[PDB]
């Protein structure tokens, strides 16, 4: 069911031929999500899942891609009778969206591993009847487009995907599962999750995609991994070129994570004439501030990881502190465990290792060391403050004694003379705390000898010491 203009670039014999197809689609009224995802999946299959016989690039012949396309459009159009679901005024109904969701869901293999690579695309859905969590939501949107439902669009948080539709684009529906061992909410709105102020629903500051942003999603969903050890250079290059295409057309303006992904790719292999990774990381942060009320975590995590890779201790600490300043205004809720795990690794592994190395380089006579900079100590404190404030009001606790040992260790990496230069001011470096835990910890933070037991008592729910 492809239009004649959609077929004139085939066969696709190179990365650039793939890019030309994306450009042509992105120049149309609406880019064809089904065509583009099939093409990406096909190429990824033959560059990452099965490279046997690869010489340059897996040539995508029209007859193959068209046959796949027709399998998909036939499956959807035969299973969804639009006459059962009347459409007033270019608006879909919740029952129709539920129907499309159920058609995709009920098509999947009964039992398979959901965390496998390379099951994100409509190629995977057609050939293997397998999709990952977010891949289901994308497939529901692609099915909707195939049915002429122009109002149905992908919604994205930083760890989940669903659909928006309906009068004014205001209706939400769950269409896929989230995480492992969580209960399904398919068909429901996301309003309880917004109301709960969980990270998973971003307090309502989530991405509402247009069709061009849906193209960006599928590009970000490219997986170059061949195994844990090795990535496909061709798929990295394709992803990078497609991200620049979208960038230049304006389609990454409202997509912070995509700008961070692009930055990472640029660090690996810089494109002549293009912005530096740091510029792109800062663009991602600016997008979150501009469009999403500065309620996103990963723009700052992308930046912090860049600084941490480059052994920039000051700027790494600053960026994690900024991360924590975002999280502090959330409630930690049951399906937010991915961001918990990220903060836990930063506090209890990443920062300890950075400061350990800094302590060695300080012994070796580094000048300008983070460990002699009071502003760096302040960033460490602001990081913990944000985590403590996050916990306030939450249905799930965050902190425990396992966190306390690393806090005491990290505080200890700064000399008392450095720590004393931070002034902790109430509402040199000046710091205001937002959390009641850190407010109570203020006086302990400048002793020459850090009082480990006192700190542990202040950070945790523990209020007594051993009886004997």
């Amino acid at each position: 069911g492809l239009k004649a203009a959609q077929k004139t670039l085939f066969p696709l014999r190179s990365i650039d031929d793939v890019v030309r197809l994306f450009a042509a689609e992105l120049g149309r009224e609406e880019p064809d999500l089904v065509l583009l995802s099939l093409v990406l999946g096909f190429v990824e299959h033959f560059l990452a899942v099965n490279r046997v016989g690869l010489t340059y690039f897996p040539v995508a012949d029209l007859s193959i891609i068209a046959a796949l396309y027709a399998r998909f459009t036939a499956q959807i159009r035969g299973a969804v009778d639009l006459s059962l679901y009347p459409r007033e005024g270019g608006v879909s109904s919740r029952e129709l969206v539920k129907k499309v969701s159920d058609v995709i869901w009920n098509s999947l293999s009964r039992s398979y591993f959901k965390d496998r690579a390379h099951i994100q695309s409509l190629f995977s859905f057609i050939t293997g009847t397998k999709l990952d969590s977010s891949g289901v939501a994308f497939a529901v949107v692609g099915a909707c487009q195939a049915l002429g439902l122009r109002d149905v669009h992908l919604a994205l948080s930083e760890d989940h995907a669903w659909v928006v539709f309906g009068p004014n684009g205001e209706q939400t529906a769950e269409v896929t599962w989230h995480g492992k061992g969580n209960e399904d909410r398919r068909g429901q709105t996301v309003n309880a999750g917004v109301a709960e102020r969980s990270w998973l629903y971003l307090k309502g500051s989530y991405m509402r995609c247009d069709r061009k942003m849906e193209v960006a999603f599928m590009v970000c969903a490219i997986n170059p991994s061949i195994d844990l050890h090795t990535d496909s250079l061709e798929l990295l290059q394709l992803q990078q070129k497609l991200l620049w295409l979208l960038y230049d057309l304006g389609h990454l303006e409202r997509y912070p994570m995509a700008l961070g992904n692009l930055a990472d790719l640029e660090e690996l292999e810089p494109t002549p004439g293009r912005p530096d990774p740091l510029t792109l990381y800062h663009k991602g942060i600016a997008s979150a501030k501009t469009y999403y009320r500065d309620e996103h975590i990963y723009p700052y995590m992308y930046l912090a990881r860049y600084h941490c890779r480059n052994r920039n201790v000051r700027e790494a600490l600053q960026a994690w502190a900024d991360t924590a300043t975002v999280i502090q205004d959330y409630n930690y809720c049951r399906e937010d465990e991915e961001i918990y795990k990220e903060f836990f690794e930063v506090a209890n592994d990443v920062i300890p290792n950075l400061l350990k190395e800094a302590a060695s380089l300080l012994e070796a006579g580094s000048q300008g060391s983070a460990l002699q900079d009071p502003e760096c100590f302040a960033h460490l404190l602001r990081f913990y403050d944000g985590i403590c404030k996050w916990e306030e009001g939450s249905p799930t606790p965050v902190l425990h004694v396992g966190w306390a040992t690393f806090l005491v260790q990290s505080l200890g990496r700064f000399e008392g003379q450095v720590r004393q230069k931070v002034r902790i001011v109430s509402v040199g470096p000046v710091l205001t705390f937002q959390s009641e835990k850190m407010k109570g910890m203020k006086e302990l933070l400048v002793a020459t000898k850090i009082n480990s037991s006192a700190i542990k008592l202040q950070l945790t729910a523990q209020s007594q010491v051993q009886m004997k």
């Binding site: 970000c220 061949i226 997509y255």
Partner: peptide
């Protein structure tokens, strides 16, 4: 073996 990750999540 390679693993899924949420699209454009940072890190490895």
């Amino acid at each position: 073996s390679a693993r899924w990750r949420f699209p454009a999540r940072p890190g490895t």
